[PDB]
Amino acid sequence: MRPPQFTRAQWFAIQHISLNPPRCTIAMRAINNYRWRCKPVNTFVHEPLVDVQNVCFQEKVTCKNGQGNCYRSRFRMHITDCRLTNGSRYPNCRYRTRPGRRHIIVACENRDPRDSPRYPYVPVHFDASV
């Protein structure tokens, strides 16, 4: 679940934007610290923050949940898919790291008041890795 201390945009960035190349088992720890079971699957976008934010102005598409506020990246982006190993037992979560470069789809919305006023419309959910 989203920890209440983070806005939707903040949690999206924590889970899905990687400045440095992600090694899944290391990078997932900050996420699973807020959880009570290992996150089974998680995608990181390894691109500058502004490039990920800018997907919110690209190709508008229907979201998997039926909402209309999703967008598909114009270009393939560098991503890393993290999948929990079959032997992992919470709280010790290990991941397989599957890098790639694909179009992404994100949901976007107006910023929360607790989000930076410099980005009025921001990504809040990772919808798809293709």
Author numbering: 0 to 129
What does the paper say about this structure?
Based on the structure-function knowledge of the RNase A superfamily we have engineered a chimera that combines RNase 1 highest catalytic activity with RNase 3 unique antipathogen properties. Based on the RNase 1 scaffold we incorporated specific regions essential for RNase 3 unique anti-pathogen activities within the RNase A superfamily. The solved crystal structures confirmed that all the chimera proteins reproduce the kidney-shaped folding typical of the RNase A superfamily and thus keep the fold of the templates used in their design, as suggested by circular dichroism and molecular dynamics analysis. Nonetheless, the structures that incorporated the key features related to RNase 3 antimicrobial activity retained the overall RNase 1 active site conformation together with the essential structural elements for binding to the human ribonuclease inhibitor (RNHI), ensuring non-cytotoxicity.
Last, a third version was designed, where the flexible loop L1 of RNase 1 was removed. Last, removal of an RNase 1 flexible loop (L1) in the third version enhanced its antimicrobial properties and catalytic efficiency. Finally, RNase 3/1-v3 was crystallized in the presence of phosphate anions. The structure has two molecules in the asymmetric unit with an RMSD between backbone chains of 0.27 Å. The C terminal β-strand is conserved in this version, keeping the geometry of the B1 pocket. While in RNase 3/1-v3 there is an extended β-strand, in the first two chimeras the C-terminus end is disordered, determining significant changes at the B1 pocket. Interestingly, an equivalent distribution of PO4 anions is obtained in RNase 3/1-v3, where phosphate n° 3 is located at the active site. In the case of RNase 3/1-v3, the replacement of the flexible loop of RNase 1 by the shorter and more rigid loop of RNase 3 reduces the capacity of the first two helixes to readapt the active site configuration, provoking a major displacement of both helixes and forming a hydrophobic core similar to RNase 3 one. In contrast, RNase 3/1-v3, thanks to the absence of the extended and more flexible L1 loop of RNase 1, might have a reduced protein motion and hence a reduced catalytic efficiency. Although the hinge residue His48 identified in the RNase A scaffold to mediate the protein motion is present in the three variants, this residue in the latest variant cannot perform equivalent interactions due to the absence of R1-L1. Two additional variants were later designed, where variant 3 combined the best of both parental proteins, achieving similar antimicrobial properties to RNase 3.
